[PDB]
Amino acid sequence: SIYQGGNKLNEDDFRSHVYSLCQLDNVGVLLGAGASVGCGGKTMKDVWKSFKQNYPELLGALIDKYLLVSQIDSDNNLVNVELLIDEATKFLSVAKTRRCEDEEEEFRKILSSLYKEVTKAALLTGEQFREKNQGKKDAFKYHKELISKLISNRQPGQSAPAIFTTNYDLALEWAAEDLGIQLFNGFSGLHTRQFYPQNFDLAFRNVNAHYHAYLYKLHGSLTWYQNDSLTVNEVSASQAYDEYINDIINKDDFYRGQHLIYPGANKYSHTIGFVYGEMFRRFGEFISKPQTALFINGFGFGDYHINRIILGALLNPSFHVVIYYPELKEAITKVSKGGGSEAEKAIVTLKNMAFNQVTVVGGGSKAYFNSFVEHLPYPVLFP
Amino acid sequence: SIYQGGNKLNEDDFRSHVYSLCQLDNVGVLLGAGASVGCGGKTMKDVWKSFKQNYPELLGALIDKYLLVSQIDSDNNLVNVELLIDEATKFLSVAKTRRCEDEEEEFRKILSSLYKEVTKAALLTGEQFREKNQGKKDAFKYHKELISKLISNRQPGQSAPAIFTTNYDLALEWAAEDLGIQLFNGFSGLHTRQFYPQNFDLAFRNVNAHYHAYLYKLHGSLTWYQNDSLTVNEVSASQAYDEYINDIINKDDFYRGQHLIYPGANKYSHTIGFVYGEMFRRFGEFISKPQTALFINGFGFGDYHINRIILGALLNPSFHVVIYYPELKEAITKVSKGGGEAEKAIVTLKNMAFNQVTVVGGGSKAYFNSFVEHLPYPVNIVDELVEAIANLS
Amino acid sequence: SIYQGGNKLNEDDFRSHVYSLCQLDNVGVLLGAGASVGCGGKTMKDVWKSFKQNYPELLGALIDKYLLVSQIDSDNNLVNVELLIDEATKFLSVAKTRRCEDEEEEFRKILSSLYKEVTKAALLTGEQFREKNQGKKDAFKYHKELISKLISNRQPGQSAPAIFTTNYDLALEWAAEDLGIQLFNGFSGLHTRQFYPQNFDLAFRNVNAGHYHAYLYKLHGSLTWYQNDSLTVNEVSASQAYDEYINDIINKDDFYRGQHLIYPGANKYSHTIGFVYGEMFRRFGEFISKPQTALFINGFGFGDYHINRIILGALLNPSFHVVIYYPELKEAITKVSKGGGSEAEKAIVTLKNMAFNQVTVVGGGSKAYFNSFVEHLPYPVLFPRDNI
Ligand SMILES: NC(=O)c1ccc[n+]([C@@H]2O[C@@H](COP(=O)([O-])OP(=O)(O)OC[C@H]3O[C@@H](n4cnc5c(N)ncnc54)[C@H](O)[C@H]3O)[C@H](O)[C@H]2O)c1
Ligand SMILES: NC(=O)c1ccc[n+]([C@@H]2O[C@@H](COP(=O)([O-])OP(=O)(O)OC[C@H]3O[C@@H](n4cnc5c(N)ncnc54)[C@H](O)[C@H]3O)[C@H](O)[C@H]2O)c1
Ligand SMILES: NC(=O)c1ccc[n+]([C@@H]2O[C@H](COP(=O)([O-])OP(=O)(O)OC[C@@H]3O[C@@H](n4cnc5c(N)ncnc54)[C@H](O)[C@@H]3O)[C@@H](O)[C@@H]2O)c1
């Protein structure tokens, strides 16, 4: 079931492995959109099904008139969402430059509707999204426990654990609100929100002689809507519910990148998204140290950029990965018949690297999120 | 040779200021595209206009049926023809999806014609192209002297030199390599030289108790290509002249599809925007180090996205700019006539009391030789080889 | 049949040996075509068999006219060609000096049609030899494992191992391509690779908060060398190679005059022009002259006079080691005791018989193959399983 160079390893020793590794200077975790699922979020499949069910006419027109995809893919549920958005953007630019009014009218709906649905799927609660007592909710036991656990495996003189989320929902300040923790992200002041690099150099300390982590918003923000005038601002999850999200979701007007969000492969057809560059440069600088550690969970395999940086400097004897993939046996079986898509071949390459710096563990029920939470032990004063 | 209000100024002060600024731990130089115009260089605009004039039969379809450009815009040289072809790169897929065969043929014919037109005049080596390191020719001998100025100005225990090239050809790079120094162009290797972002933040030293330089190509490459390797492969020129450049040189009408990686195309494909984004990131954020002096020359500020990026990159408070305008008198006369956006903006910038901006309007003093001479300097090798070789019968 | 002073040793002793030798200041390895038979390639035996029964004129002349060989040796297939190559060089020298004409032509033909076959036995793949991403085949997994193990075992304060190749192909560089490994073999360059004596002290560093390499010392030159009048070796890929300098096999015949640089011949002074070769030997001598340094030999065919003489003179280093994995150990000793022996087999027999415990000869047979050698080297273990 588990193959590591033809040998066998036990999780009992891996417990001590994690416990000792976390004591190393660098500590972090590289998650994805899988975490949102644990809190009740909607996966890509659900969003695609909703879009295809709520707009049958567009699907039929695409199937018949132009045949960008075949009905076989739809029958087998092998439809990708990002490719559709990128195709829509390129066709929209073609229309805008060719001045085809009807194509512009029929394509200024696909983009606007797609982004409206993306935003609607971003929220994890619905009408409760405007309700307060956000920390007090009982569905965030995951984040509430995990933030403290990451910060509470330390003794004075160590670093700040880093949590990686790649979802629109502002779901990380909520557990922080519950526990009073401050997941810093380089912003100061409530009434006004702005970015400053120096703000990243603040850490709590006992004066008469704290628990917090740090934030990398790789997947943009839900309310940093750039007005194309050199501005960035944030509006609380209950205040933006009426100001501009309501206007752009109910006024049925022309759609642009009103609030910056990138769910499609086409990234820099609009070149004013600077969170991309800053966050990715910081991510690149992170692995530049020895005695390094990191973990992965709740993340798929479709990220060209991050998954190039991953193996970029896995040629260090201190950077590691503890990567799980429940659908690894199926991927291997599919590849054995000739090969798969980008994801299958990428995971095969990741698993087949001849190093011991990496290891893969599976088994199905044994690799659940609750199991990942339970693996972390309680710190011991006298080991 | 800087004028401000009609009073003469000495070049010694500017030379001393430049020398003082060059001592910073973060310094670099840039070479303009027009500097090579005097050494047989060519611009894509000239070939584009020559081809469009020679074949006006297709012109009607290019604008009326596609509207990527307007006749006024095409004639005014206010277009990004590279972006025109890049947009054709997706028009091809649009037609294929729509089964628009006639437009597909039109796009393919124009792409191949423009490719061959640009290629045939860019060989500059005849049938001996595949010979490696053909920079030994005396045509660029003078340029070598310039490089000699970058060796005696580097003191021990100082930041290593940085090299930035603007052209997309290796004519200057072949010479630079022939001088006998190790330069990295973002890749490492001999047979299959690939892209690796780690090398952007790594240096070299001696493990036991030293000089490294970085070559930054600002126009991609004529060598960078993609043989379905899912990566970027770079090699020497010979196998390039045998693999895919041959047909681009010889075949009149021959294209295959979205396989190669140049010259800033296929961005919508995931496989080519990644490296370009990495290079843009490093270019824009390399000035993040303290004690940095940056010089930008030859940029028209005519691109919306690049203009916005430059405006946002004002974070560095130690930026200096020098602008050479060979037609300053013409701009002044035009302003005197109540006419002329770019000309008015540059005139307004030149007509303000800001000492950190340098303007040169000598006209005939802006030549390449004058610029080389302005740089500071300290203050028959092969002749006998031919005789010795000839003596031995 | 295992005998070491009438006693035996357990696996723990060998494991401690491997751990200590790897953890010493320096590590050693030497690679030859010995066990390169199980990868689907070809051996020189088939090449010689084809050569004898495909060129009747020269074989008949040698048997009858030249008398430079013996029929019995050819029948037994135990003859050597390297001595014949040296004899060809000497014959060409004398014939050129004396101003003979026909013999000049015949010996030029012999030399060129022998160089052709010398280069012809370094493909192992066929037509697909000319492509990129060459490190994507089943024949390099063991090479990848060995290189990763040899490059990983250098904790802080420990340098990269030195590797010796002694064949024609570049399988190891091709295993290097696939893992971001650049096995610095004495040449660093893209357009022109020139020998810089100071290139041995260059490596990557984590300047602002990949350190993999070795020293693949080449003492046979390289198949990928083409010698120009400029006294420099610009270097090419496998496909560029197949294109521009080894297409003479089919189109043309016997027009090769000192382009690529590889010599099976025993003599090292007919090819005296090179002086960097003495620098390679000097690097070997620097290797021999340090304590806690070990050399491992797998693939050496007992065919040197300079390097092996340095081995004898250097084995007197209190820590230099010399070990060979050669299954035919009992047979050679028995044959020597029976009055046989080869040109150099007596030398290895003596080195086994040398009274130095610094050198120990260990066999086993099936466990002494290149696969076992690759599997032997373990990875560094800092965080993983420990003791106490
Ligand atoms: N604005 C910015 O600052 C910025 C910068 C860079 C990137 N981004 C965005 O960041 C990237 C975030 O990644 P993403 O949104 O494209 O997708 P993703 O990688 O976050 O998720 C892909 C999906 O795979 C699913 N999945 C999990 N396990 C799976 C399995 N075993 N098999 C199959 N599927 C599985 C998950 O439900 C889901 O994560 C976006 O690509 C990109 O738009 C934004
Ligand atoms: N790493 C790299 O290889 C790299 C780096 C930077 C740019 N590029 C190139 O840039 C990317 C896109 O091209 P681009 O639009 O940024 O550059 P560009 O030079 O093609 O366009 C810049 C703008 O300047 C305007 N302009 C005004 N006056 C001009 C003049 N006298 N001469 C030239 N232009 C004048 C043009 O209208 C417009 O092209 C492509 O990848 C590639 O073509 C590549
Ligand atoms: N003149 C020069 O400048 C120059 C250049 C390179 C090497 N050299 C040197 O040249 C000498 C020969 O080169 P090498 O050491 O690389 O050769 P090598 O390492 O390739 O020798 C191994 C080969 O396998 C053996 N072999 C193959 N088939 C056999 C068979 N059927 N039966 C028995 N034995 C068989 C042969 O002994 C042959 O030597 C070396 O001492 C040394 O490398 C000199």
HEC profile of A157-198: CCCCCEEEECCCCCCHHHHHHHHCCCCECCECCCCCCCECHH
CA–CA dist B376, B152 (Å, integer) = 11
**Spatial CA neighbour of A217 closest among A139, A181, A163:** A163
CA–CA dist B27, B154 (Å, integer) = 12
Strands B187-188 and B194-195: antiparallel
Residues of C with Cβ-Cβ distance to A313 under 8 angstroms: 210
Strands B292-293 and B26-27: parallel
State the best of B190, B202, B245 to mutate against chain C, taking most chain C CBs within 10 Å: B190
What are B214's strand-pairing partners? B162, B184
Q: Which residue has the tokens 């109540």?
A: B338
The total of other beta-carbon atoms located within 10 Å of residue B85's CB is: 19
Interface of B with C in 180-219 (CB under 8 A): 180, 182, 185, 187-193, 196, 198-199, 201-208
Return the residue whose CA atom lies nearest to atom 7 of ligand 1: A219
The alpha carbon of B20 is separated from its chain's Cα centroid by a whole number of angstroms, namely: 27
**Residue among C145, C380, C383 whose CB faces A17 most closely:** C383
The alpha carbon of C155 is separated from its chain's Cα centroid by a whole number of angstroms, namely: 28
A9 touches chain C (CB under 8 A): no
Q: Which amino acid is at B347?
A: V
**Spatial CA neighbour of B49 closest among B89, B21, B18, B76:** B76
Nearest 5°: phi and psi at A321? -150, 140
State the best of C137, C199, C205, C240 to mutate against chain B, taking most chain B CBs within 10 Å: C240
Instruction: Report which secondary-structure segment, H or E, holds B154.
Output: none
Query: 3-state DSSP call for residue B291?
Result: coil
**Spatial CA neighbour of C203 closest among B159, B199, B180, B191:** B199
For the record, the structure tokens of A302 come out as: 């479709």
- The number of helix segments (H) and strand segments (E) in chain B equals 16, 10
In this structure, is the dihedral angle defined by the CA atoms of residues C173, C178, C183 and C188, taken in order, positive or negative?
Answer: positive
Rg for chain B, CA atoms, rounded = 24
Rg for chain A, CA atoms, rounded = 22
- Give one DSSP letter per residue of A213-272, joined into a string: -EEEETT--SS----SSS------TTTHHHHTHHHHHHS----SSSS----SS--SSS--
Which residue out of B30, B80, B268 has the highest number of ligand 2 atoms within 8 Å of its CB and is therefore the one to mutate? B80
The total of other beta-carbon atoms located within 10 Å of residue B266's CB is: 19
Q: Which amino acid is at B266?
A: N
Strands C203-206 and B202-205: antiparallel
Instruction: Report which secondary-structure segment, H or E, holds B76.
Output: none
Residues of B with Cβ-Cβ distance to A93 under 8 angstroms: 87, 90
If you measure CA to CA, which chain C residue comes closest to A285?
A: C209
Buried b (16+ CB within 10 A) or exposed e, C306-327: ebbebbeebbeeeebbbbbbbe
Residues of C with Cβ-Cβ distance to A339 under 8 angstroms: none
Query: 3-state DSSP call for residue B198?
Result: helix
Direct distance between the N- and C-terminal alpha carbons of chain C, in angstroms, rounded to an integer: 36
Buried b (16+ CB within 10 A) or exposed e, B217-250: beebbbbbbbeeeebbbbbbbbbbbebebebbee
Q: What is the largest distance, in Å, between two alpha-carbon atoms of chain C? A: 80
Neighbour-count burial of A38, counting CB atoms closer than 10 A to its CB (0-12 exposed, 13-18 middle, 19+ buried): middle
The alpha carbon of B74 and the centre of ligand 2 are apart by a number of angstroms equal to: 16
Do the beta carbons of residue B78 and residue B48 sit within 8 Å? no
Residues of B with Cβ-Cβ distance to C193 under 8 angstroms: 190
CA–CA dist A239, A245 (Å, integer) = 10
C158 touches chain A (CB under 8 A): no
CA–CA dist A92, A84 (Å, integer) = 12
Do the beta carbons of residue C207 and residue B201 sit within 8 Å? yes
C253 Cβ contact partners less than 8 Å away, ≥ 6 residues apart? C112, C113, C116
Nearest 5°: phi and psi at A172? -100, -30
CA–CA dist A9, B115 (Å, integer) = 58
Residues of C with Cβ-Cβ distance to B196 under 8 angstroms: 180, 210
CA–CA dist B113, B107 (Å, integer) = 10
Ligand 1 pocket by Cβ (under 6 Å): A 32-34, 43-44, 166, 218-220, 262-263, 273, 275-276, 279, 299-300, 302-303, 325-327
The total of other beta-carbon atoms located within 10 Å of residue C99's CB is: 7
CA–CA dist C177, A109 (Å, integer) = 48
**DSSP letter (8 states) at residue B234:** B
**DSSP letter (8 states) at residue A366:** G
Direct distance between the N- and C-terminal alpha carbons of chain A, in angstroms, rounded to an integer: 32
CA–CA dist A263, C96 (Å, integer) = 77
**Spatial CA neighbour of C274 closest among C224, C216, C227, C215:** C227
The total of other beta-carbon atoms located within 10 Å of residue B4's CB is: 12
CA–CA dist B363, A118 (Å, integer) = 57
Q: Which amino acid is at B260?
A: L
* Cβ separation C180–A315 shorter than 8 A: yes
* Cβ separation A354–C179 shorter than 8 A: yes
CA–CA dist C273, C260 (Å, integer) = 14
Buried b (16+ CB within 10 A) or exposed e, C151-176: bbbbeeeebbbbbbbbbbbbbbbbbb
Query: 3-state DSSP call for residue B158?
Result: coil
Ligand nearest to the CA of A281: 1
CA–CA dist B2, C177 (Å, integer) = 54
CA–CA dist C329, C345 (Å, integer) = 10
What are A214's strand-pairing partners? A162, A184
**Residue among C159, C191, C239 whose CB faces B174 most closely:** C191
Strands A321-323 and C215-218: unpaired
Residues of B with Cβ-Cβ distance to A279 under 8 angstroms: none
* Cβ separation B66–A98 shorter than 8 A: yes
Neighbour-count burial of B117, counting CB atoms closer than 10 A to its CB (0-12 exposed, 13-18 middle, 19+ buried): middle
The alpha carbon of C202 and the centre of ligand 2 are apart by a number of angstroms equal to: 37
**Spatial CA neighbour of A269 closest among B231, B299, B304, B96:** B304
CA–CA dist B368, B362 (Å, integer) = 13
Point out the ligand 3 atom lying closest to the alpha carbon of residue C77: 31
Cis? peptide before B263, omega within 30° of 0 = yes
Q: What is the 3-state secondary structure (H, E, C) of chain C?
A: CCCECCECCCHHHHHHHHHHHHHCCCCCCEECCCCCCCCCCCCHHHHHHHHHCCCHHHHHHHHHHHCCCCHHHHHHCCCCCHHHHHHHHHHHHHHHHHCCCHHHHHHHHHHHHHHHHHHHCCCCCCHHHCCCCCCCCHHHHHHHHHHHHHHHCCCCCCCCCEEEECCCCCHHHHHHHCCCCCCECCCCCCCCCCCCHHHHHCEEEECCCCCCCCEEEECCCECCECCCCCCCCCECCHHHHHHHCCCCCCCCCCCCCCCCECCCCCCCCCCCCCCHHHHHHHHHHHHHCCCCCCEEEECCCCCCCCHHHHHHHHCCCCCCCEEECCCCCHHHHHHHHCCCCCCCHHHHHHHHHCCCCCCCCCCCCCCCCHHHHHHHCCCCCCCCCCCC
- Helical axes B44-54 vs B101-120, angle rounded to 10°: 130
Query: 3-state DSSP call for residue B251?
Result: coil
Do the beta carbons of residue A28 and residue A147 sit within 8 Å? no
What are C218's strand-pairing partners? C165
Do the beta carbons of residue A224 and residue A265 sit within 8 Å? no
B92 Cβ contact partners less than 8 Å away, ≥ 6 residues apart? B104, B107, B108
Direct distance between the N- and C-terminal alpha carbons of chain B, in angstroms, rounded to an integer: 56
Count A/C contacts: CB-CB distance under 8 Å: 33
Helical H segments across chain A, by residue range: 11-22, 34-38, 44-54, 56-61, 71-75, 82-98, 101-122, 141-151, 172-179, 240-243, 245-250, 274-286, 304-312, 328-336, 342-352, 369-375
CA–CA dist B354, A73 (Å, integer) = 63
Buried b (16+ CB within 10 A) or exposed e, B71-82: eeebeeeebebe
* Touching subunits for chain C (3+ Cβ pairs under 8 A): A, B
Do the beta carbons of residue B95 and residue B101 sit within 8 Å? yes
- Determined by cryo-EM
Nearest 5°: phi and psi at C379? -80, 160
State the best of C145, C155, C206, C213 to mutate against chain A, taking most chain A CBs within 10 Å: C206
The alpha carbon of B34 is separated from its chain's Cα centroid by a whole number of angstroms, namely: 10
